[PDB]
Write a protein that binds this ligand. Structure first.
Ligand SMILES: [Fe+2]
Length: 872
DNA sequence: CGCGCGGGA
DNA sequence: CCCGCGC
């Protein structure tokens, strides 16, 4: 975020061009440019980007999300003067309070109202109880009294709450998540009246949003229930309509939920006081809200002076009236427990699957249980973020290891002189040069061997934020504290400043976007500054300074005393390691499994990043797109377990060996890897990993470049390997880590292990001469699949998934033989809906395959941070 | 292999 | 919209 500027995020369905005019008027008076953007998935994108000290200066969203944001410290406490607070309705300030602190400015107010057809019904009923009689007369005329969305509890809640239902009890400025108000007498009476309407055929259990909107907008029903977002569509229709206060129930007002569109200030913003004056003196004025409202209407508004103007529209007045009779939507993440439980209960009470009593009793206990587990998971997550490696570090152990490392450096130097140079396999290694292209030979049917540097340039120097560690003492410090044990005397360790690492990450993404999501001239310019480490074994540690960010070390953790004073007040984590695997039995096994899975047709071909490149995938996916998928694997894997006439599990044995052999090679150098696996894979997720690894998906590419990118929904560390087939020369195709300032050509069997959702990376396009093929493959954790599979396991039994898969393949085929392609798709669609409903139930019970950040919905940015402190 | 159909969202 | 699937 740039100081001296203001960037605003607001959803695309709002008047952003009108807001831009307020910023343009702001830029005139003070010289501060205001940029309004409307990113997609704004509710998801803001907590992900704000948690890293980045993102907008101001966020516009429904107030209910902002308590979640405040729990994570993403929002600044706003400080309106008492005079300014008087300009806005009191209840709107209540909607933007967390922990007794104001955390946002209210802007607009929305709630459900009663919408009625003036020709069908000149005087709409003041009470719910009149509606059955009124419906009887309208039925005689070929109409109905009322249709509205019964599928979503947002729409049915006003009736359920009228006589006493509530979500979470509010007291002393806090929501008590132990106190859910779904099971009291008022809620029961509300839901009962609703189902009595259905039972007496006044309403249909099937009516959803689309059916009710189409019915009201065509003149078929006299009333609906909807919010101000629905008025535009009625305004194109022929219906003469009004908007009024919801009916009462037992003489009590219906209590719709109230959503307050609010502007909050990013905690990481350097422009807090500028954002405050823009919001107070420019937006929250009559002129300000007008400019927005003219673009797209705000509805009702929190600013009293402008709301008195808007309320001349009876639809606005009704909106604010129902809002003031309503229930401010609770601003805590545990509302998700509430929504799922009440949605289920209303659907079951309406269909007859449960009585009202049974439906609400289960919703009460299930929402409270789910809300509780949500808290337990959120506190458990802080423990995994702050967890420490088994302690092997000590001053005594540091020194012993330094001496061993120092001995090995002399051995390596001796056999370097004896041999005439440095080699990785048969490839001559010279750090003075950058390997722009290189030759491979294939003398026998084993893997092709890197033999000769062809094109080169002088090797660029390390960027300023990356420094090679010279000291065996420092090397031993980091090796013991970080769980890294590279080839003694034949590796280089680097320290990378965390702040500069983050900036360089941003510069790299900027370049890729400026190039048109491709390796173009901006990416090439970065590449020309990358230092080649081809043939080397290296590890990069990032050092985070103690806040006197992308990375979240716990500076309350145990501290070691570094040999190097410059580590003091810093925490280190492992962001990347490059290994060179000597060819032998393990590379034989790995290469053979890739060949077996290719020959047997077990790779699913897919395209990534649009059409950036082609990737083949295998492993324990769950492609929910495939309606009949109900077990681990791509569709080819599901089929092979049934159609094989030899051994149904053969490919699962092949995949486990493939994952475990790669894992084993890596674990020998990187002892933190099994600790990471043990820390983040749940008991419920373990059966859906490939063997005893943190890998569930394996990719495979063939002579493919990949644009620079961050992965997002993968694990904390990713493994990538390469191996070659046939002879030839490869130009380009480097793996590039531009935020670390390095790149390399893969040789006989190079592996990189790195933090793929945190370190930008990609692969340059290549040109080949001869038959040479460079095979690349990622082993990674794609946590969506393991979560959905862990959820399916809890619903049906882990071992029952193969039987379900078998049956579902069998009856999709039967439909295709009997009634053709269209019937088969109908059966698969029914299977998907059954599957979906099973997954949601288990997801609602907090069944999980991996531990995840509740705020970001992603895995931690790093693990196993070690704090260093050198007191004098 | 291309393009439709599809789920989740 | 997208490191699927099938005619
Ligand atoms: Fe990647």
């Amino acid at each position: 975020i740039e100081e001296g500027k203001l960037v605003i995020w607001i959803n695309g369905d709002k008047g952003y061009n009108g807001l831009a005019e307020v910023g343009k008027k702001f830029e005139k008076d003070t010289g501060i440019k205001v940029t309004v953007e409307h990113p997609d998935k704004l509710e998801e994108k803001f907590p992900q980007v704000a948690a890293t000290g980045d993102g907008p200066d101001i966020i516009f969203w429904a107030h209910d999300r902002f308590g979640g944001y405040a729990q994570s410290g993403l929002l600044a406490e706003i400080t309106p003067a008492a005079a300014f607070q008087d300009k806005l309705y009191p209840f709107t300030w209540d909607a933007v309070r967390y922990n007794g602190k104001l955390i946002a400015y209210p802007i607009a107010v929305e709630a459900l109202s009663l919408i009625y057809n003036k020709d069908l019904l000149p005087n709409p009923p003041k009470t719910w109880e009149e509606i059955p009689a009124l419906d009887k007369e309208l039925k005689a005329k070929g109409k109905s009294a009322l249709m509205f969305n019964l599928q979503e509890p947002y729409f049915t809640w006003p009736l359920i709450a009228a006589d006493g239902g509530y979500a979470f009890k509010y007291a002393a400025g806090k929501y008590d998540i132990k106190d859910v108000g779904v099971d009291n007498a008022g809620a029961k009476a509300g839901l009962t009246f609703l189902v009595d309407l259905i039972k007496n055929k006044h309403m249909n259990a099937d009516t959803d949003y689309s059916i009710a909107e189409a019915a009201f907008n065509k003149g078929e029903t006299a009333m609906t229930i909807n919010g101000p977002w629905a008025w535009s569509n009625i305004d194109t229709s022929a219906v003469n309509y009004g908007v009024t206060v919801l009916p009462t129930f037992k003489g009590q007002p219906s209590k719709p939920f109230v959503g307050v569109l609010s502007a909050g200030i990013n905690a990481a913003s350097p422009n807090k006081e500028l954002a405050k004056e823009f919001l107070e003196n420019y937006l929250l004025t009559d002129e300000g809200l007008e400019a927005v409202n003219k673009d797209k209407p705000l509805g009702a508004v929190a600013l009293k002076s402008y709301e008195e103007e808007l309320a001349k529209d009876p639809r606005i007045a009704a909106t604010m009236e129902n809002a003031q009779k309503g229930e401010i939507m609770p601003n805590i993440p545990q509302m998700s427990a509430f929504w799922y439980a009440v949605r289920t209960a209303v659907i079951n009470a309406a269909s007859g699957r449960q009585t009202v009593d049974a439906a609400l009793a289960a919703a009460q206990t299930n929402a409270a249980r789910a809300a509780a587990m949500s808290v337990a998971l959120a506190s458990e997550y802080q423990l995994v973020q702050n967890a420490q490696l088994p302690q092997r570090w000590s001053q005594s152990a540091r020194k012993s290891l330094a001496i061993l490392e120092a001995t090995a450096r002399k051995e390596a130097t001796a056999q370097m002189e004896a041999a005439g140079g440095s080699f990785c396999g048969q490839f001559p290694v010279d750090p003075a040069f950058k390997v722009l292209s290189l030759e491979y030979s294939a003398p026998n049917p084993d893997i092709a061997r890197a033999i000769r540097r062809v094109d080169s340039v002088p090797n660029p120097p390390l960027p300023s934020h990356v420094v090679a560690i010279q000291s065996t003492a420092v090397d031993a410090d980091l090796s013991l504290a970080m769980g890294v044990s590279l080839t003694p005397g034949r590796h280089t360790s680097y320290l990378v400043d965390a702040r500069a690492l983050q900036q360089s990450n941003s510069a790299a993404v900027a370049a890729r976007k400026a190039d048109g999501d491709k390796w173009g001239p901006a990416c090439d310019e970065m590449f020309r500054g990358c230092r080649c480490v081809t043939g080397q074994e290296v590890v990069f540690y990032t050092a985070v300074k103690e806040p006197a960010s992308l990375f979240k070390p716990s500076f309350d953790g145990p501290a070691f005393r570094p040999s190097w004073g410059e580590l003091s007040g810093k925490a280190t984590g492992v962001v990347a390691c490059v290994l060179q695997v000597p060819i032998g039995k393990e590379t034989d096994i790995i290469c053979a499994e890739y060949d077996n899975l290719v020959s047997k047709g077990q790779f699913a071909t897919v395209d990534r990043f649009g059409g950036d490149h082609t990737v083949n995938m295998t492993g324990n996916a769950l492609i929910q797109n495939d309606g009949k998928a109900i077990s681990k694997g791509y569709a080819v894997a599901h089929r092979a377990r049934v159609t094989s006439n030899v051994y149904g599990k053969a490919n699962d044995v092949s995949l486990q060996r493939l994952a475990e052999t790669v894992w084993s090679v890596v674990e020998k150098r990187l002892s933190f890897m099994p600790a990471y696996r043990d820390l983040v894979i749940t008991e419920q997720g373990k059966p859906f990993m490939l063997g005893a690894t943190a890998t569930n998906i394996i990719s495979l590419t063939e002579n493919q470049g990949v644009m620079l990118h961050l992965d997002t929904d993968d694990g904390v560390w990713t493994i990538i390997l390469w191996f070659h087939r046939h002879s030839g020369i490869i130009a380009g195709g480097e793996f590039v880590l531009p935020s670390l300032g390095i790149s390399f050509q893969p040789l006989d069997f190079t592996i990189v292990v790195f933090a793929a959702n945190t370190i930008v990376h990609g692969t340059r396009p290549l040109q080949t001469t001869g038959k040479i093929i460079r095979w690349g493959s990622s082993h990674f954790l794609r946590f969506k699949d393991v979560n959905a599979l862990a959820q399916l396991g809890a619903a049906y039994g882990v071992d029952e998934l193969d039987a379900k898969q078998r049956d579902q393949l069998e009856e999709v085929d039967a439909a295709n033989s009997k009634d053709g392609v269209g019937a088969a798709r109908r059966v698969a669609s029914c299977m998907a809906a059954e599957r979906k409903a099973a997954i949601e139930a288990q997801k609602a019970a907090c069944v999980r395959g991996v531990v995840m950040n509740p705020c970001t919905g992603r895995m931690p940015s790093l693990l196993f941070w070690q704090v260093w402190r050198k007191p004098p």
